[PDB]
Paper text:
The interaction of membrane-bound active RAS with RAF is the first step in the activation of this pathway. Active RAS recruits RAF to the membrane where RAF dimerizes and becomes active. The N-terminal CR1 region contains the RAS-binding domain (RBD) and the cysteine-rich domain (CRD), the CR2 region contains a 14-3-3 recognition site, whereas the C-terminal CR3 region includes the kinase domain and a second binding site for 14-3-3 proteins. Here, we present crystal structures of wild-type and oncogenic mutants of KRAS in complex with the RBD and CRD of RAF1.
We crystallized the GTPase domain of KRAS (residues 1–169) in complex with RAF1(RBDCRD) (residues 52–188) and solved the structures in two different crystal forms, I and II, at a resolution of 1.95 Å and 2.50 Å, respectively. Despite having different crystal packing interactions, the structures of both crystal forms are very similar, with r.m.s. deviation of 0.40 Å for Cα atoms or 0.45 Å for all atoms. Since crystal form I was solved at a higher resolution, subsequent analyses are based on form I unless stated otherwise. The overall structure shows that the two tandem domains of the RAF1 CR1 region, RBD and CRD, directly contact one another to form one structural entity, and RBD as well as CRD interact with KRAS to a similar extent. Similar to what has been observed in the HRAS-RAF1(RBD) and Rap1-RAF1(RBD) structures, the KRAS-RBD interaction interface is mainly formed by the switch-I region, where RBD and KRAS interact mainly via β-strands and form an extended β-sheet structure. Interestingly, the CRD interaction with KRAS does not involve the switch regions. Instead, the KRAS-CRD interface is formed by KRAS residues present in the interswitch region and the C-terminal helix α5. In the KRAS-RBDCRD structure, RBD and CRD are connected by a short linker (residue 132–137), which brings these two domains together with interdomain contacts, resulting in an extended structure. Calculation of the solvent-accessible area shows that 658 Å2 of RBD and 555 Å2 of CRD are buried when RBDCRD is in complex with KRAS, suggesting that both RBD and CRD have similarly sized interaction interfaces with KRAS. Similar to the solution structure, our crystal structure contains two zinc finger motifs—one near the N- and C-terminal ends of CRD formed by residues H139, C165, C168, and C184, and a second one near the β3 strand and 310-helix formed by residues C152, C155, H173, and C176. The structures of the KRAS-RBDCRD complex provide atomic details of the KRAS-CRD interaction interface, which is similar in size to the KRAS-RBD interface and also consists of nine hydrogen bonds.
Numbering used by the authors:
A (entry chain B): 56 to 103, 108 to 185
B (entry chain A): 1 to 169
Amino acid sequence: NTIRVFLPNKQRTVVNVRNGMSLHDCLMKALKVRGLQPECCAVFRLLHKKARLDWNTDAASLIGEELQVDFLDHVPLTTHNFARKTFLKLAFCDICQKFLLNGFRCQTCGYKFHEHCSTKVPTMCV
Amino acid sequence: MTEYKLVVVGAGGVGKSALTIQLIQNHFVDEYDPTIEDSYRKQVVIDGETCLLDILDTAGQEEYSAMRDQYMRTGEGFLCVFAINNTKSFEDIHHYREQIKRVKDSEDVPMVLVGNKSDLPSRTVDTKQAQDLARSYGIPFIETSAKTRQGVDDAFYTLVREIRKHKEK
Ligand SMILES: Nc1nc2c(ncn2[C@@H]2O[C@H](COP(=O)(O)OP(=O)(O)NP(=O)(O)O)[C@@H](O)[C@H]2O)c(=O)[nH]1
Ligand SMILES: [Cl-]
Ligand SMILES: [Cl-]
Ligand SMILES: [Cl-]
Ligand SMILES: [Cl-]
Ligand SMILES: [Cl-]
Ligand SMILES: [Mg+2]
Ligand SMILES: [Zn+2]
Ligand SMILES: [Zn+2]
Ligand SMILES: [Zn+2]
């Protein structure tokens, strides 16, 4: 009893369904681990474009169908834009808080970090 | 920006999802929530290069072996995960390796053997057993704990480096 759900930024999840679950219920964890919030997302139903759904719909009514989740229309939560950086002033890494001689910096949000701290930078650029 | 197609495979419950989520979210998933199919994307600086990692987290069990064929064809490198406290999961590794080799038609596929749950004291797969198996496949072996994050970076960094060693990226 499943639904394949396409997620923003070319991701996807297949969620398990048992009677008594809303769309917000089945997808809360999938969005969380990916740095996404249902507040900035809409959920649709794939047709063969798409059809907007409310986040509290009975998931059992959508079993065997294909869904899609998108950022808010023209409010796309962007992805970081990393650039190599030599810090001339005293700088510390935003991940490990240790001294940062040189590292990387997102040109959009300003996160600065060591290369080997980069896996800990959050996925989404705020 | 250079994209890397990684696939995490192994028996159910070895920690494939906990490893991936530790990389993606920097959080340990304590619950058991068996995977059907989950893909993730994350940017990672590896040897000064910004890398887009496309990570496919897979199910421990598929009803038909043929259901894996497609994602093994598209995947560029494979983390083959067992748990050091789960002898059956170590014994199951070879089935994944032989399926990947069959689908790719190559004995030189980028892969890393990952022995996870190294935090648990009930170890039953010795590190020499694991090294022997990795040596027999010609691949690296890395011990990880998704719970403490020991070795998690190492596993994914090493897999990316194995992909580059195999093909121009
Ligand atoms: N102590 C410890 N527990 C771990 C570790 N990694 C995973 N676990 C636990 O092991 C269980 C299964 O982990 P999980 O990531 O779901 O495994 P999986 O290989 O993805 N399972 P599946 O194939 O069904 O999707 C969970 O309870 C999780 O918390 C680890 O390194 N240490
Ligand atoms: Cl500066
Ligand atoms: Cl910050
Ligand atoms: Cl390839
Ligand atoms: Cl040992
Ligand atoms: Cl590491
Ligand atoms: Mg899983
Ligand atoms: Zn379709
Ligand atoms: Zn950013
Ligand atoms: Zn740091």
